[PDB]
Design a protein around this ligand. Sequence first.
Ligand SMILES: COc1cc(-c2cnn3cc(OC)c([C@H]4COC(C)(C)C4)nc23)ccn1
Length: 304
Amino acid sequence: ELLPIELDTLVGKGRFAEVYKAKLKQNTSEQFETVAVKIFPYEEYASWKTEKDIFSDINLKHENILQFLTAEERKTELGKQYWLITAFHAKGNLQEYLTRHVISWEDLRKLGSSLARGIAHLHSDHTPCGRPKMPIVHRDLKSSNILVKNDLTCCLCDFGLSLRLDPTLSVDDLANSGQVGTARYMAPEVLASAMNLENVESFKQTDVYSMALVLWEMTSRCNAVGEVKDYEPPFGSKVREHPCVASMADNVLADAGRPEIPSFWLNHQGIQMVCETLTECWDHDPEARLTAQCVAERFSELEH
Ligand SMILES: COc1cc(-c2cnn3cc(OC)c([C@H]4COC(C)(C)C4)nc23)ccn1
């Protein structure tokens, strides 16, 4: 049976689906509960299925991963819709949050350390207890799809382009997907079409590079650095609003371009640590990049 849900507001429109703030009126007498509904048309059934498989995976439950209530199929006059019902985070996406607010050092520490913890959890080949689990690579990490919870910690969602690192995966299966994701956040090796298709685990390195760009966005809006400029997306000054891969290749790969880090930012000890860490993470060489777990560990050291 379908949950008693009333759609309130359209909060997100993506290639695959629409996200709605909704009211779950389980009970007529008591106050309604705010939930999120991601709606996929029948044409996007595949994206719905990929996300559903992730959200319903018991091993994937984590504080930094969007909480999942249920998946439904709803017949409509036009056809059928595929729904994902989840917890709603009122603060919204990280990109919009950074645009509107200048964060404290404590905020940056919480946001950056929780982002790394969520990615590390997806990447992990084992559960906290010690049981083997099949790693997931997000493949489309960016500030626009990271939610901010009420306690100012990050929460991952938008798993439509995600890849389970299954051993049975073929080169043909992988190459066919090719460059998947947002061009602005693509790692240089992806822009170069230089990956080893047989090596599925190298996709973890691409996620780390995108994470580095997000960490830089958080850092750019932190008041600890000093004077804070208006929020700009990575490469905002260099490329157009919807950049192509050729143009991103030109900047990221040909010019080795990265978002600028003014030297005055380094004056703060904490900011310096974050900048050094993120710099290692966006290195041209994937091998030079730290793991998400390593980054989570460095953030732990930031209490000092
Ligand atoms: C993108 O995939 C999602 C998002 C949610 C979701 C949960 N709370 N929440 C709150 C939001 O704003 C107030 C949005 C807007 C904000 O920014 C976006 C464009 C990401 C949509 N989305 C969500 C649930 C399931 N999948």
